[PDB]
Amino acid sequence: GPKFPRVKNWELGSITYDTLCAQSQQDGPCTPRRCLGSLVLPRPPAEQLLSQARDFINQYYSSIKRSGSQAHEERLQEVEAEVASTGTYHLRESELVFGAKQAWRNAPRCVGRIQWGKLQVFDARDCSSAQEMFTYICNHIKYATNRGNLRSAITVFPQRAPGRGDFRIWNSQLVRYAGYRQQDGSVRGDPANVEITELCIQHGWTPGNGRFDVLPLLLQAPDEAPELFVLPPELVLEVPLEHPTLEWFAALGLRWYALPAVSNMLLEIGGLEFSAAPFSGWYMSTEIGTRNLCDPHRYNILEDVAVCMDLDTRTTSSLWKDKAAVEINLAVLHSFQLAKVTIVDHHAATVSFMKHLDNEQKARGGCPADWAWIVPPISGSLTPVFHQEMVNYILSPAFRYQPDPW
């Protein structure tokens, strides 16, 4: 009936319509001729800045129920004046907080959005050096880790400025394991991290040689070479992996870090671009257990675990990969619980997401979601989100990919 996408849940038979998608002011990669929804990474003039700024200020005043008021029209005139004399403008602190949270809420690929209202926003817009960035980051890590009782947080560094260089954190995460290319062609540690490891070495880092060496931070303040900073070990909480019934699993010496803190994304609010704005939550167990440890192009431990479980690895039909993978995931969950470090399994996460979808249906008339990323990498059809159709679209404020600084 209504002129909006109809959206079905096939488990429950329930129907909704997404009206929120009509607020998208930015095109995705799909056309009526072909769907490109499965691609990971598909491919200012003051007039364009102003329309984005106005849109965000409207968003802000709506959220505090003062839409159309005197303070709304004054903030609008102030932003236009600011832009008129300087080419850019600045956010009030409470505007920054609302934007950072709206950006997380708007992120289609995040299954953890039930939590979006509980985000601690650290304003670091006064930072003027790389040393100072290191201080802010350390504080963030400390606050976010909270000795294993993890708290969502984001630290926002100064925005892109006309005729000045960007604040950048070169590492893709605040905590990452080194990946050392060996003379045979293979990689010790995390192959995902080969490039960043070699950049750290060029910049003067004395390299380790373990499978789990924590990388130093490479931090770049405006118009300056990046500087190297070693994280003090006591700040970086790690969890050794053991299995509840398989006693040998502990002998593998596997481990992972507690804090998933992404640091290379661009946070865009009202046309303003924050090139350095690391944020962190807590892991879903399949991220560590299935992706980081079992991806063929990552740690690739599946065959090793399977051999220890004495499975038949000469034939697909023994389901040795599925069997090993479940035990690895169980080890991740059990170890994190034993260490009292916050973690969530893929069943509890997806159930909480279904609740999130129901909330946003009422609050906003929809919720942008990327099915391929929301559905977990193991046990897909055993979670409720698998049977839930989703509509994917770009809303702003937004977290965005950005080119590597080198």
Which residue of the set 273, 282, 320, 360 is catalytic? 282
x/- mask, a second copy, residues 23-62, rule CB under 8 A, reads -x--xxxxxxxxxxxxxx--x-------------------
Q: Which is nearer to a second copy, 195 or 224 (CB)?
A: 195
- Asked if 241 contacts 256 with a C-beta cutoff of 8 angstroms, the reply is yes
Residues 213-272 that bind a second copy (CB under 8 A): none
Distance (Å, whole) CA 294 – CA 305: 10
x/- mask, ligand H4B, residues 119-158, rule CB under 6 A, reads ----------------------------------------
Distance (Å, whole) CA 170 – CA 263: 8
The CB density around residue 346, as the number of other CB atoms within 10 Å, is 25
Q: Which three-class secondary structure state does DSSP give residue 214?
A: strand
* Radius of gyration for the chain, computed over Cα atoms and rounded to the nearest angstrom: 23
> Which has the closest alpha carbon to 119: 397, 403, 401?
397
Residues 304-363 that bind ligand HEM (CB under 6 A): 344, 349
In sequence order, what E strands does 47-129 have? 120-123
Interaction of residue 291 with a second copy, rule CB under 8 A: yes
Q: What is the secondary structure of 80-91 as a DSSP string?
A: HHHHHHHS----
Contacting residue, 281, 289, 368, 376, with ligand M85 by CB under 6 A: 281
Burial label for 314, CB within 10 Å (0-12, 13-18, 19+), is: exposed
- Asked if 40 contacts 373 with a C-beta cutoff of 8 angstroms, the reply is no
Residue 305, amino acid: V
Interaction of residue 351 with a second copy, rule CB under 8 A: yes
Interaction of residue 373 with ligand HEM, rule CB under 6 A: yes
Contacting residue, 46, 76, 250, 262, with ligand M85 by CB under 6 A: 262
H or E stretch at 323? helix 320-338
Contact footprint for ligand M85 (CB under 6 A): 40, 112, 172-173, 260, 262, 281-284, 287
Contact footprint for ligand H4B (CB under 6 A): 10, 38, 40, 372-373, 386-389
Contact footprint for a second copy (CB under 8 A): 5-8, 10-12, 18, 21, 24, 27-40, 43, 290-291, 294-297, 302, 316-319, 321-323, 325-326, 329-330, 333, 337, 345, 347-348, 351, 370-372, 375-382, 384, 386-387, 389-393
Catalytic site residues? 110, 113, 282, 287
